[PDB]
Amino acid sequence: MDRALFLAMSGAKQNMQALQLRANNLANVSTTGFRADLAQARSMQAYGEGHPSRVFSMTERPGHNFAQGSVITTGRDLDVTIEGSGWISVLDHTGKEGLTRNGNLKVDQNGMLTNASGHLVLGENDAPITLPIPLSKIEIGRDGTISVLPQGAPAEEFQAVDRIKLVKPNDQSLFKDTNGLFRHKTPNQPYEADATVSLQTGAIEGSNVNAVGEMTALIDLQRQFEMQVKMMSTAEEMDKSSDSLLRM
Amino acid sequence: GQSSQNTELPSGLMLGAGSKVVATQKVHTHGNAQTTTNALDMMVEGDGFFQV
């Protein structure tokens, strides 16, 4: 009736969308290698004829919190966490390379080295790392080196079999995909294996969600959402009053 | 499903669906030793399982 009803409804609707984004971070506080998503608003003006008075706002995800997560000491040989900045190259079910930080590795019956989510871990050959089947001691090196001990071999028969592919690209050039894997924004760009990233074995990296930061932004979203809803109510109240012009 | 198109813009906004427990992983680390006086209780030191 006044077009400020929809100008306030759009603000209220977008505040809900940001609320959904923040609610996902709090649901994933204990997730392993989880990078908290950011949420903000962008002021888009309705350029055209008339007075410049109508400006819309839509929520967006400008980036992610790439800070180091919470490191959990598990005392497990197949548990590794990236020291500082870095990534682990994995391929999902489709077979597409993606950067993850879930260092909760495991070995299946065939010997393939996967993580807790089932993604195959890549190596120096750029193929998934496959270990000999009858292992007796698996130790992950500081720089991603995988050294195994054949079953029944003496303690001096320690040899490396593969190297974990660690990638350290620019963080702002990465986007989280639909399955939680970070990839390059520019397609068909190779993930160069970095020789600086270090793995702190014997530990698992948790999420970096700042729980208090999420809550203090939730209380702001509620207030801004409710103010716009009152604008919707005052918009219809004005329309009802102006309806008496034609009455006679 | 063009996520890489404008992922930092309002058109590229993606919302998660929550969280779930993917697995309950077993940690088969070697436990400590209990020295008993019974002659029929036994332990495997290292890899191996009793078969019943």
Partner: peptide, 19 residues
């Protein structure tokens, strides 16, 4: 203000560059 040419539609883009 009665004109003879229909007013153009307002535009609300994400980026003014791609407009």
């Amino acid at each position: 203000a009665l004109s003879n040419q229909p007013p153009a539609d307002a535009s609300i883009p994400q980026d003014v560059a791609q407009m």
